[PDB]
Amino acid sequence: WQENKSWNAHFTEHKSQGVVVLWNENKQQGFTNNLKRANQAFLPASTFKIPNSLIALDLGVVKDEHQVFKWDGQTRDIATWNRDHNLITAMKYSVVPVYQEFARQIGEARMSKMLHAFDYGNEDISGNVDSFWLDGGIRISATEQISFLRKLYHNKLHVSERSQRIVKQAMLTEANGDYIIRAKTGYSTRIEPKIGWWVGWVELDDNVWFFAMNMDMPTSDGLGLRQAITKEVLKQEKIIP
Ligand SMILES: C=C(C(=O)O)[C@@H](C)[C@H]1OB(O)c2cc(F)ccc21
Secondary structure (H helix, E strand, O other): OEEOHHHHHHHHOOOOOEEEEEEEOOOOEEEEOOHHHHOOOEOOHHHHHHHHHHHHHHOOOOOOOOOOEOOOOOOOOOHHHOOOEOHHHHHHOOOHHHHHHHHHHHOHHHHHHHHHHOOOOOOOOOOOOOOHHHHOOOOEOHHHHHHHHHHHHOOOOOOOHHHHHHHHHHOEEEEOOOOEEEEEEEEEOOOOOOEEEEEEEEEOOOOEEEEEEEEEOOOHHHOOHHHHHHHHHHHHOOOOO
């Protein structure tokens, strides 16, 4: 691991504090601006939609990426949640109530066994089966997110190849002729410290760069900084133009 404190400039530019962790897959080398915070374990919030999706698909709770999960008719504050979703749109709009229902169907015994099989964070699902990743016991660090994502990239998690391919499709965030980003955002507001996450990877022609960042997020106004700050680091490191 190498520490690169120069990336703190990108946080300071926005009156923010946080960590970005990068992993160069070809070279098996990691870089971060803060070795301590890189290994600090936090609630995953909606980054948990990655493992939750994989488990739901492997147990048949989700049949495929086209299956429609009808809105339950309860009007919630995020307007895009107040409609029917499939796996692609539920990931895109981070539709908590869809994933809460998945978790109830999975159940606590299978959820716990799956997170142990995935070596996921502290493997502790204490709390409500349908909210432990928001206000229960599960904690994961940025470097732990990378370990998990590397297994997903290589189809090495303890679920089917199909489930892993479908979730990677559903993680698609950005693509152009220079790179592909597959990732998931998170926003942990229920338990201090309030933080934002962005975790995933950048596919290049001849390498993949895994990333996991989190940052203090005292209000929702800064959510776009999750991606912006990460992209400043990726640009500095010549991973994206
Ligand atoms: C869209 C989001 C994101 O891009 O983060 C957020 C708002 C969403 O996704 B999660 O992180 C999560 C958790 C909650 F308890 C409530 C809402 C969300």
